Design a protein around this ligand. Sequence first.
Ligand SMILES: C=C(C)[C@H]1CN[C@H](C(=O)O)[C@H]1CC(=O)O
Ligand SMILES: C=C(C)[C@H]1CN[C@H](C(=O)O)[C@H]1CC(=O)O
Lengths: 251, 251
Amino acid sequence: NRSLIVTTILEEPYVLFKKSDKPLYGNDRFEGYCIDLLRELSTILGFTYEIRLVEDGKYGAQDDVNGQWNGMVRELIDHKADLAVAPLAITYVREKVIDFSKPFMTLGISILYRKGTPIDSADDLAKQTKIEYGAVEDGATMTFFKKSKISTYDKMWAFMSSRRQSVLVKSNEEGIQRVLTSDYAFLMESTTIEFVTQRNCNLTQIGGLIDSKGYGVGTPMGSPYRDKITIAILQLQEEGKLHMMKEKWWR
Amino acid sequence: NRSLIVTTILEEPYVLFKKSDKPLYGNDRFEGYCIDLLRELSTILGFTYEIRLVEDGKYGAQDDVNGQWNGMVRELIDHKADLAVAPLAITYVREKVIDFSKPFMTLGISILYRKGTPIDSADDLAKQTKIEYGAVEDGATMTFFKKSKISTYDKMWAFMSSRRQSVLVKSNEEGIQRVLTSDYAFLMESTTIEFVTQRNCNLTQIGGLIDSKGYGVGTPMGSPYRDKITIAILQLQEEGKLHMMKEKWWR
Ligand SMILES: C=C(C)[C@H]1CN[C@H](C(=O)O)[C@H]1CC(=O)O
Ligand SMILES: C=C(C)[C@H]1CN[C@H](C(=O)O)[C@H]1CC(=O)O
């Protein structure tokens, strides 16, 4: 049985380079929530695999003009990878081109901002133009605002869109630093906000969840592995493994 | 200036009877998140008040048959109280008969269940009948399902409605005990689930948040105190006090 090619991307605490003095080889060079998840999926389902980092460094978005997909989503579409195991959001637009297992983690979009201000919700940001705000460019969060029919979010999209190169960033880290060094609020996924605020007492989540979504394993559309991965994830859930992995990497 | 009559209700860790070795009088007989909140509200705004427990022990729902409102919402409507300070959900139906300050806490509906099973979402419950499920009768959670146009939730409402006396309960504690002793899942507010699961390792939240809402201070509609309470809440927010109050009472 040839080994599966599993595409992923660096993102703390899901995927990180394992540190050591002694040389690390193959899949052992990686660690994190998604790495532990993947290992369990392989032993539960009985497959071997090789971890690779998505070449273009993206999750998956469709080009507005040429309509082509990029990121891990595109690698799956083109059968360049068998599975994608990362904090990949399960979204309607993505489900149209690839398949997803049931979620291994639930979350929602929220706001990351500095403490000490009266800003208390998305509405507060939307009704003003002084404090700038944004999201990772073309990520699931930004796309949510772009496709939203809700006036408040539509207004926010118009804002970010008009100042695209100034307010949209390339990573969660860039967004975090931007919040820390300027009057800026960052729209990001709650599970990452959770990790960040526990490590920086100057940061806080603002308001509650803007939506409800989850992360799932991606497979090429029609892959016989999608349903099998779901079975493995459900077993991990009932065995309390998913909860243990969350506590392990978030602590 | 006459003292304001503040209505509230017993609910850990928001409102509890303070335990003492010496007799306690007036407002000193109560403690909890909402009691600390109310105290800060009074000093920021300069009013005196008397805490009272809602006479009928209800939060506020409208009777399906005769259309009469009950609970704290009704006491405000009839001007029997000036303010309602409790874990009272800000909802569309309630906003029609009373006014709410901006929320002092955000949360969402979710599922409380025992650990060790493959049950992973509302859909899992909705598509079966073996495992019974419900919520506090006529509370904000039950009303959400009753008014929902989402197929999944509408199906769940049909279930609860048809087994009303068997699956709907009178309190959170009742739903909790029910989850611990029988094959039952309880739909409850996330902030309470958080308190409960931290104190009972046998319990766990299932899935993500089903909706997004918040708790707010209630006032008779048109009351001049509503905007003043909001000013106080936003101040507590920016000063980090709402966060400390949450930490204090949730541990
Ligand atoms: C880290 C990044 C750029 C990812 C992770 N989940 C989202 C995705 O699956 O696109 C992105 C974050 C976001 O959009 O807030
Ligand atoms: C404790 C109770 C019955 C309250 C608290 N918030 C909700 C309300 O404001 O109705 C209810 C819980 C729920 O409906 O799940």
